[PDB]
């Protein structure tokens, strides 16, 4: 016998599971269309150097990578943003801006799940916080579309520019991205573990204190005290909250100075979806990354912002809230030939039903009417169309609503 | 600068290209729904042993495979059918039959394109030729849905049981699959090249002659002469053509004794889509594979049939026929704030438009009304909604159909 289980850390999607996945993706697609985003895709296989950012990120540490027979360093993508940037950089100035691009790539890791799907939404060429507003609104929209409300979830919001200043004032920008990465672990691991990693980086106790203090500031007015009420970060966050309020999602968003995210390239606003019961990891996460494309070699800086919204946590949350009823398969009609002699006519009928835009099966193998009705019920047919000899000569079939009257063929549809 | 081109043999899908892909996939999805097929998926990464069939197949020869760090032999799938079978075998008798499963997996190869998408349709648990009929009808349906007609394309049809007999009568079944694989190359390479490979296998000139002769038989009546009018293969092919005729696609299908296909596991009917101008490779291909699941270790034999329908040839054909007009992006509304002071109201309006199921952008960065209208035109907006101070106090906005009247907010939608 052959191994029936999938490769380590990977999921099979038989029909029942695939319907659940579809329910989720329909929402991501529908939301992207509602917000004017355009679909794109790129190869799951990318060059390894595309991710070599040298900042101690988990996403680069846990790369599912290998070498081709031709000796090329490749990887199954751990995230999409680098593919996006590559695509953007290749377009250059033929690319018209602003651009709003989205996708639902499978992404991979190696260390426990080794793949996940991640809805990516990104706005490109928009300097202002209106991009982040739109992005954050898209994510709430998606969650509400799935049945969640502001009671169930929210979106925490911060700016890395705050911490940028404190790192600048205590020194060298080259170390900022590495620090954000370490400081991201603060919620997870003890302060002792994070302090030591920051000290290992070569930062002194003075700057570490200031970092700690600023992560634990509770309101935007407190950030104004420490940084100034016209630090670009303050005006931006106020603009952001004002705009989200005006769109009607003020109950969904809030400030949190502890939110930095684990990715090196964020420069401005960052955000995280969360459940309001404290039970699950981040539902999504994102932010502004204005320098990435400059780092990839762009002559002109390209402002960007976006998020990723995984397919795991959201599903667990929806299951907990009882918002993932299994929805069984459906089909409009099941055509039932009275017997094999009636098959040709049954096919003709099947053609008519399908030509009208209906979803229709025909009983394929040899079986009794009563077996076929049960079969019809099992596949979730709305209607069973029995094709029998007597009715056929009257130009009719027998129709029976499952959720048996004689009907003229033209009336079936 | 970073490498902007994708990894060797792989395609990028920027928005313009992705729309073309979507047009094609919408059809595969829509067709699968019309025919009552159910979506499934499995990991692109599968165990290498899953494909070790030892019959000299191109699909196994050209495997994009590698070794994990844990020392496991894996591969990026060259086809889906083995994943399907694995999924089916794991379900066992909890699986209800017949089952009609479909997917659109990316599949890979290493040798020139190294990936392609392939619509897979498969019927499971159906002994009779009604499965093949349905499958063949689905493929024609798809092609017509894309704008092709019976003038443009057809589906060639044959049975391997014919050749099965001739191999049996001249000898040992273990060699049958290898022979089908060699005989598949007949159309491509010289008869001398195919003869030598069959002779290399250990088959004598007598059986080779008989093979050649039977591949070049032109009608079903000629196969009846050589094999008998009640060879199961004759009755099946007549049943098949009778049923396809009755469904209304008789002009789309025909017999061809040279069609064997390149895959080892086919046992009964096999078929190939083709363009009637002789310009392109196979558009799709499929057949019955009644022993595969027995070979994977099933206690009870499971009848199966299916096809794969690639995304390359079909597109070239549609391009040649001028049936792939580029269809530009569309969005219902573009909300234009008169200026930044109007942004909050513009957002509120944006919310209303989207709540009504409309697709809507808002101008995100700072720009002049006339720039924003041009922007609206460039994104293919059906309508531009200008939000200006004077109209706002009258409870109105300015609306202008792009494919400027004042309108009350409640009337916008
Ligand atoms: N790539 C990020 C999400 C993102 C998309 N765009 C910007 N950020 C992640 O995996 O967390
Ligand atoms: N796997 C086959 C197509 C197929 C699906 N089901 C049966 N056959 C191919 O790649 O050609
Ligand atoms: N980056 C990433 C890739 C794959 C999985 Cl399953 C999880 C993460 N976090
Ligand atoms: N099996 C296969 C896989 C990938 C490509 Cl691009 C082509 C083929 N034929």
How would you describe this protein?
- 2 copies of one chain form a homodimer.
- Chain A has about 425 residues and is of the alpha+beta class.
- Chain A has 2 domains: about 325 residues, Bira Bifunctional Protein, Domain 2 (BirA Bifunctional Protein, domain 2); about 90 residues, Rossmann fold.
- In chain A, about 40% of the residues lie in helices and about 20% in strands.
- In chain A, the strands form 3 sheets. In chain A, strands 1, 5, 6, 7, 8, 9, 10, 11 and 12 form a 9-stranded mixed β-sheet that branches.
- In chain A, helix 1 packs antiparallel against helix 4, helix 4 packs parallel to helix 10 and helix 6 runs antiparallel to helix 7.
- Chain A starts with 14 loop residues before the first helix and ends in a 5-residue tail after the last strand.
- The site of one histidine has 10 residues of chain B, from strand 7, strand 11 and strand 12.
- One 4-chlorobenzene-1,2-diamine (4JJ) binds next to strand 6 and strand 7 of chain A.
């Amino acid at each position: 016998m052959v191994e029936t289980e999938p490769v380590q850390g990977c999921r099979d999607f038989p029909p029942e599971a695939m319907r659940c996945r579809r329910h989720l993706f329909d929402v991501f697609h529908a939301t992207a269309k509602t917000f004017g985003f355009e679909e794109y895709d790129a190869p799951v296989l990318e060059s390894e150097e595309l991710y070599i950012r040298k900042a101690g990120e988990e996403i680069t540490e846990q790369m599912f990578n290998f070498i081709t027979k031709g000796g090329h360093r490749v990887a199954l993508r751990p995230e999409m943003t680098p593919s996006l940037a590559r695509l953007l950089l290749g377009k250059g100035r033929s690319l018209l801006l602003p651009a709003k691009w989205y996708s639902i790539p499978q992404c991979w890791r190696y260390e426990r799940r080794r793949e996940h799907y991640q809805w990516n939404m990104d706005i490109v060429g928009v300097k202002s916080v209106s991009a982040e507003v739109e992005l954050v609104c898209a994510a709430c929209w998606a969650m509400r579309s799935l049945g969640l409300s502001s009671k169930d979830v929210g979106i925490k919001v911060n700016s890395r520019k705050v911490l940028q200043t404190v790192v600048e004032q205590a020194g060298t920008s080259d170390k900022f991205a590495p620090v954000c990465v370490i400081v991201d672990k603060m919620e997870k691991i003890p302060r002792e573990e994070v302090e030591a990693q920051l000290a290992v980086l070569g930062l002194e106790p003075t700057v570490v204190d200031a970092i700690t203090t600023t992560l634990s500031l509770k309101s935007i007015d407190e950030i104004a005290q420490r940084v100034g009420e016209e630090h670009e970060a303050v005006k931006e966050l106020r603009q952001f909250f004002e705009q989200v309020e005006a769109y009607g999602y003020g109950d969904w968003v809030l400030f949190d100075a502890s939110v930095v995210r684990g990715l090196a390239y964020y420069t401005g606003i960052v955000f995280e979806g969360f459940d309001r019961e404290g039970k699950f990891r981040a539902l999504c996460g994102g932010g502004r990354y204005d320098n990435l494309l400059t780092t990839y070699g762009s002559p002109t800086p390209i402002p960007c912002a976006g998020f990723g919204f995984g397919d795991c946590v959201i599903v667990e949350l929806l299951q907990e809230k009882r918002l993932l009823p299994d929805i069984p398969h459906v089909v409009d009609d099941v055509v039932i030939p009275f017997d094999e002699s009636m098959r040709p006519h049954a096919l003709a009928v099947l053609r008519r039903l399908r030509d009208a835009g209906r979803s229709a099966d025909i009983i394929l193998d040899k079986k009794k009417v009563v077996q076929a009705f049960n079969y019809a019920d099992r596949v979730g047919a709305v209607r069973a169309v029995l094709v029998a000899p007597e009715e056929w000569e009257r130009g009719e079939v027998q129709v029976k609503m499952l959720r048996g009257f004689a009907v003229p063929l033209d009336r079936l549809v």
